[PDB]
């Protein structure tokens, strides 16, 4: 909640360069994506969390129950971070690394 902005996301240090007067930041889809911290005047980027879904590669339940998981386009040096696998149950983390 910055200056009357309501939303959900993950805040990280950003790189864009604002103007002395401009505060918010909007993307092509007309949504807030960059917000300036009111107290200390740097710029924070807002990113979505909770990767919506994956694709499971499974044979028929007749044969077995072992499955593969495909992540859509993500470079997997950070899939333990992108999935937030730290909070997952130990069964999921088998397919996380």
């Amino acid at each position: 909640n910055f200056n009357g902005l309501k939303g959900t996301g993950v805040l990280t240090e950003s790189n864009k360069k604002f103007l002395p007067f401009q505060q918010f930041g909007r993307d092509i889809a007309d949504t807030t994506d960059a917000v300036r911290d009111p107290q200390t005047l740097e710029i924070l980027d807002i990113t979505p969390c909770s990767f919506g879904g994956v694709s499971v590669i499974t044979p028929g339940t007749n044969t077995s129950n072992q499955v593969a998981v495909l992540y859509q386009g993500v470079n997997c040096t950070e899939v333990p971070v992108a999935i937030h696998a730290d909070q997952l149950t130990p069964t999921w983390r088998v397919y996380s690394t």
């Binding site: 919506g52 499971v56 997952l88």
Partner: protein
């Protein structure tokens, strides 16, 4: 997870697309600008 999305106990071979079905309800923060702009409340409340 792909058993839950299909709403069926047996799933045929192939590639599916699952829902999220996972959650981690987090905390919240509210940052608003520095408070300074104090009032002359002390003047009216405290006097002789």
């Amino acid at each position: 997870e792909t058993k839950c999305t299909l709403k069926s106990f047996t799933v045929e071979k192939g590639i599916y697309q699952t829902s999220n079905f996972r959650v981690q309800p987090t905390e919240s923060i509210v940052r608003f600008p520095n408070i300074t702009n104090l009032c002359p409340f002390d003047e009216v409340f405290n006097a002789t």
